[PDB]
From a paper:
The activity of some formins is regulated by an N- to C-terminal intramolecular interaction that renders the protein inactive, giving rise to the classification as Diaphanous-related formins (DRFs). Here we uncover the structural basis of the specificity of FMNL1 and FMNL2 binding towards Cdc42, its membrane association, as well as the dimerization properties of the formin.
The structure was determined to 2.5 Å resolution; the asymmetric unit of the crystal contained one heterodimer and the structure model was refined to an Rwork of 19.4% and Rfree of 25.3% with excellent stereochemistry. The FH3 domain of FMNL2 is composed of 14 canonical helices that assemble into 5 armadillo repeats with the first 2 helices resembling a heat repeat fold. A loop sequence of 55 residues (150–204) that is not resolved in the crystal structure precedes the second helix of this non-canonical element. On complex formation with FMNL2, the carboxyl groups of E95 mediate salt bridges with H222 and R261 of the formin, thus coordinating two armadillo repeats of the effector protein. The interaction is sustained by a hydrogen bond between N132 and S361. The sequence motifs 93RKKFRRR on the first and 206RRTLKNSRLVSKK on the second helix assemble in a way that all 12 basic moieties are exposed on the surface of FMNL2 at a position adjacent to the Cdc42 binding site. Particularly, the Rho-GTPase-specific insert helix α4 of Cdc42 is involved in interactions with the fourth and fifth armadillo repeat of FMNL2, contributing thereby to the specificity of the formin recognition.
Residue numbers in the entry:
A (entry chain A): -1 to 177
B (entry chain B): 32 to 149, 205 to 377
């Protein structure tokens, strides 16, 4: 009678989903980009004096796997819907793709809005690239408003690179799943 | 293994991705198979088709109409996800002789857009659904249908479908305009596409009362200060429509059409852009131009 929790990670390609999963479980940041098809990892975790098995499911961000990805969805307890804070386009896809898609396949399943790559929010080289394309990074406030409108449990952000906010992301996911 | 290469087909994978999956230990395939079995779809195609027919039924008082359509956007979003992420067979059923999904979808889009496009009751009703995201979501549905080879073909052969897609260029959301242009560009690139596109833009001109065809396309493209993606999609589409034709004399006539609408003068300023995505489209156009 070991208790189980299934957490599934989604969002645009190259947003950071695999790094954040690997940095959190393993404490190392993987330097080579290798696009995901599907993967899963498992971890033991204690909340309120009780152990749970936390299942973690990595998914493909790219559209070509659009009919493969929903096989990862059944029995999901909590979703992490991720976007990069330095990619407005990935932010937009949150509303247009990712939230509609998990709500359709898994009604009544909580999700968190996860801003990723926050370390890059102050990198001038990054600010410069967005600037040439008439863009800026996403501010916490802006993301928080979207999280409200789409009925996310809450908004959280992290860097898989610095591990800042990383633990708290998963803390929040667990709590969201047991509420 | 063979209960796998059938699950493989249902996923509409490009050959390079299918090949990659194929070199998978016979164990993994099994896990994939188990995953499919575990997987159930939400609704059959006629669920969504019936709702759309309900929205279109003029025998309904305004009351039930307003109440029926209060979830229209939600229903369209569920149809779009179904079209885009269910097994490809779900799409075939939607498109089939019993269902005629493509007809109802095109019909609803036309209705959603009727107001924007310029019986007083249906004009009133349309205005109800024309300020929501319905149009945009219908365009997304068409996009999903078009990623399926057979579905792409039905869109081409359809009497109204690309006509209506072109009409959506009038939608005030630049994100919507971009998507339309991407769809229009894709159709234009396949054999027989160019004629369908010109015919669609002739139809656009008449219904919208333009002086010359592409008039409003150019308006929107000139008028837009801020959305790089829409500008990228506009430039790309223009370059395909003038420069992909077989007849060189036709190419130059097409080129001058846009010249008479001030593209050349506009690209004069625009070529100094900072955006590298837009830069490449403009360059491609300039490289293709005749003297
Ligand atoms: N600076 C910074 N870079 C990051 C961070 N997380 C990921 N990256 C970089 O982002 C790129 C892609 O990350 P990855 O996790 O592979 O993305 P993904 O979301 O799984 N994409 P896919 O859907 O294809 O699997 C890699 O260059 C990785 O190095 C971060 O927190 N900070
Ligand atoms: Mg990856």
């Amino acid at each position: 009678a070991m208790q189980t929790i299934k957490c599934v990670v989604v969002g645009d390609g190259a947003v950071g989903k695999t790094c954040l999963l690997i940095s959190y479980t393993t404490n190392k940041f993987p330097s080579e980009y290798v696009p995901t098809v599907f993967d899963n990892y498992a971890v033991t975790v204690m909340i309120g004096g009780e152990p749970y098995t936390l299942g973690l499911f990595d998914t493909a961000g790219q559209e070509d796997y659009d009919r493969l990805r929903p096989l990862s969805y059944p029995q999901t307890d909590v979703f992490l819907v991720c976007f990069s804070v330095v990619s407005p386009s990935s932010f937009e896809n949150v509303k247009e793709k990712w939230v509609p898609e998990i709500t359709h396949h898994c009604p009544k399943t909580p999700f968190l809005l996860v801003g990723t790559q926050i370390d890059l929010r102050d990198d001038p080289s990054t600010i410069e690239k967005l600037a040439k394309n008439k863009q800026k990074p996403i501010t916490p406030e802006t993301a928080e408003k979207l999280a409200r409108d789409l009925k996310a449990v809450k908004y959280v952000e992290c860097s898989a690179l610095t591990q800042r906010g990383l633990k708290n992301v998963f803390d929040e996911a667990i709590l969201a799943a047991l509420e | 293994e063979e209960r796998f290469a059938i699950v493989l087909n249902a996923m509409n994978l490009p050959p390079d991705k299918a090949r990659l999956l194929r070199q998978y230990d016979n164990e993994k395939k099994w896990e994939l198979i188990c995953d499919q079995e575990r997987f159930q779809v939400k609704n059959p195609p006629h669920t969504y088709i019936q709702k759309l027919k309900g929205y279109l039924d003029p025998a309904v008082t305004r009351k039930k109409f307003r109440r029926r359509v209060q979830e229209s956007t939600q229903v369209l979003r569920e149809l779009e996800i179904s079209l885009r992420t269910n097994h490809i067979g779900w799409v075939r059923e939607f498109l089939n002789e019993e269902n005629k999904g493509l007809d109802v979808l095109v019909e609803y889009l036309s209705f959603a857009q009727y107001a924007v496009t310029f019986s007083r009751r249906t004009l009133k009703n349309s205005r109800l659904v024309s300020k929501k995201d319905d149009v945009h979501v219908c365009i997304m549905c068409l996009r999903a249908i078009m990623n399926y080879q057979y579905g792409f073909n039905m869109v081409m052969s359809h009497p109204h479908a690309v006509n209506e897609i072109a009409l959506s260029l009038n939608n005030k959301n630049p994100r919507t305009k971009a998507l339309v242009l991407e769809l229009l560009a894709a159709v234009c690139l396949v054999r027989g596409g160019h004629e369908i596109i010109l015919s669609a833009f002739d139809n656009f001109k008449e219904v919208c009362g333009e002086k010359q065809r592409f008039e409003k396309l150019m308006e929107h493209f000139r008028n837009e200060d801020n959305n790089i993606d829409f500008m990228v999609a506009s430039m790309q589409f223009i370059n395909i429509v003038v420069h992909s034709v077989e007849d060189m004399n036709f190419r130059v006539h097409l080129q001058y059409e846009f010249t008479k609408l001030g593209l050349d003068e506009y690209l004069d300023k625009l070529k100094h852009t900072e955006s590298d995505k837009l830069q490449v489209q403009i360059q491609a156009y300039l490289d293709n131009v005749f003297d």
